[PDB]
């Protein structure tokens, strides 16, 4: 339920010599901070409204840690070239996800730490925060290194300690934004294709967050083994939108129902085709 | 606060 994440990305680029580091931090699936090297004056910016209050002694704090990460990836990126015998001066990507999950009780539930290289998985910190999982043979090099160097301890001390301690604080303020939501505004549309056949598309606009569900049905019976559904798309206004469709014989429109399920809704939205 | 990776690189 209550989780904090940090997605990091370092991307090598042709001739540029220096990679582009981008650190994005999430709180309950909601971005609240972001760092980017390319920026005019590279540093952490508050991506959320409730972060504006944080003192400068915190922004000069993070950016200094970000600058530190940036170099770590820079070095780690050169090491990989060796492992895979990739040549220098080229585009390669190294990503990292890390954060902590909390249960109903605001004690730590699970810790997260995993690296990826070139899209693929590389090495990950297991659920016990003691051992490592190595994807390909190269990662077994990194693991052996991190084993004999006692790397796990450092990450566990964070996930459990500092990580959690700060998520609480981010929830002492976030619990005034990540609670309010916008509701869907569904409406079926009628489109004709092929002789004696029409597609009925059930739209749903203006909802937040993106998590939602659309259902078609025949005479009341659940239908999904035949429907066409498109992934949730961002409206671009802070809200999202989605729709599903069905192909049905002409003159049989009113037979179908379209129920819409969303968080910020008191009760499912049953819809039908109008004149 | 974000994570500050272990000194040991990849």
């Amino acid at each position: 339920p209550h989780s904090m994440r940090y997605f990091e990305t370092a991307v090598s680029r042709p001739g540029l010599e220096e990679p582009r580091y981008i650190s994005v931090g999430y709180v309950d699936n909601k971005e609240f901070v972001r760092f980017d090297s390319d920026a005019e004056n590279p540093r952490y910016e508050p991506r959320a409204p409730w972060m504006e209050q944080e003192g400068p002694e915190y922004w000069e704090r993070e950016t200094q840690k970000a600058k530190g990460q940036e170099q770590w990836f820079r070095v780690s990126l050169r090491n990989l070239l060796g492992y895979y015998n990739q040549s220098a001066g080229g585009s390669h990507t190294l990503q990292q996800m890390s954060g902590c999950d909390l249960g109903s009780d605001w004690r730590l539930l699970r810790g997260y730490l995993q690296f990826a290289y070139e899209g693929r998985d590389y090495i990950a910190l297991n659920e016990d925060l003691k051992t490592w999982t190595a994807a390909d043979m190269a990662a077994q090099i990194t693991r052996r290194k991190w084993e004999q160097s006692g790397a796990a301890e450092h990450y566990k001390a964070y996930l459990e300690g500092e990580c959690v301690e700060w998520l609480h604080r981010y929830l002492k303020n976030g619990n005034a934004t990540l609670l309010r939501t916008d509701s869907p505004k569904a409406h079926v549309t009628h489109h004709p294709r092929s002789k004696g056949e029409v597609t009925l598309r059930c739209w749903a606009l203006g909802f937040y967050p993106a998590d939602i569900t659309l259902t078609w049905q025949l005479n009341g019976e659940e239908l999904t083994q035949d429907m066409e559904l498109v992934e949730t798309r961002p409206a671009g206004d802070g809200t999202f939108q989605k729709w599903a469709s069905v192909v049905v014989p002409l003159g049989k429109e009113q037979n179908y129902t379209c129920r819409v399920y969303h968080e910020g809704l008191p009760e499912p939205l049953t819809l039908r085709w109008e004149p | 606060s974000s994570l500050e990776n272990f000194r040991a690189y990849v």
């Epitope: 170099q71 160097s149 001390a157 | -």
Partner: T-cell receptor, first 111, second 108 residues
Framework: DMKVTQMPRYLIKRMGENVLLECGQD?????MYWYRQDPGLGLQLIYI???????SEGDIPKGYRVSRKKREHFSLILDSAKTNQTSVYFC?????????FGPGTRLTVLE | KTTQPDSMESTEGETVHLPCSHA???????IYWYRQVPLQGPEYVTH???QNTTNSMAFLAIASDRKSSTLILPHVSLRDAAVYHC???????????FGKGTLLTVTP
């Protein structure tokens, strides 16, 4: 297995001259160090290279400059030697665990 | 930072104790122990975060809830005479600052 070496072990030079101490590991550790310690005090950090052209000051940067063009090597430069810069110099390297120190270079800067 | 006694007397056989008071510890920071025999340069002995690590040579014992620690040297010999340093090294930092440690003399 884990050896770090520094050439010119001993070196005497007249004040104002160009001093160049070298240090090699042949194990390609990402990070290397330059320390000095006088019979008086103990170890103080001069420079630390995290990797090739990535070098950062330290505690006693004034009077020294460094050059990291290969992981294996790490050279210490004294443009204008100074009498008080007559300490003992230690090079080191690490990969994440502890630091692996060299044998030490004894530099006497005579007037 | 840390703090250690300047000197420390011992004899050929006795098992030595080397204190190292170190409160105000980030807990994100490890504790390393280096030995520097005169002439030579510092070499690594052991390190630990919590619990109680150990090596083929010495035993490291970190006090409960940090704030202090102690290095144990078993049946010591002459060659075990030097200056033992107790440094705090952050898990994300290659820099470690040497004090002047503890000059351990071992009488035969």
């Amino acid at each position: 297995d884990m050896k770090v070496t520094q050439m010119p072990r001993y070196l005497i030079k007249r004040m104002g001259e160009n001093v160049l101490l070298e240090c090699g590991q042949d194990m390609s550790h990402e990070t290397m160090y330059w320390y000095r310690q006088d019979p008086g005090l103990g170890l103080q950090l001069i420079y630390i290279s995290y990797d090739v052209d990535s070098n950062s000051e330290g505690d006693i940067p004034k009077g020294y400059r460094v050059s990291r063009k290969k992981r294996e090597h790490f050279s210490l430069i004294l443009d204008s030697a100074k009498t008080n810069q007559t300490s003992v110099y230690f090079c080191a390297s690490s990969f994440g665990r502890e630091q692996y120190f060299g044998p030490g270079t004894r530099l006497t800067v005579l007037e | 930072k840390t703090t250690q006694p300047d000197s420390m007397e011992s004899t050929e056989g006795e098992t030595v104790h080397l204190p190292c008071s170190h409160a105000t510890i980030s807990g994100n920071e490890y504790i390393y122990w280096y030995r520097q025999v005169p002439l030579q340069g510092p070499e690594y002995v052991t390190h630990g975060l919590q619990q109680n690590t150990t090596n083929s040579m010495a035993f490291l014992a970190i006090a409960s809830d940090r704030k202090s620690s102690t290095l144990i040297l078993p049946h010591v010999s002459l060659r075990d005479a030097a200056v033992y340093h107790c440094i705090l090294s952050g898990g994300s930092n290659y820099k470690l600052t040497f004090g002047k440690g503890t000059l351990l003399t071992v009488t035969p």
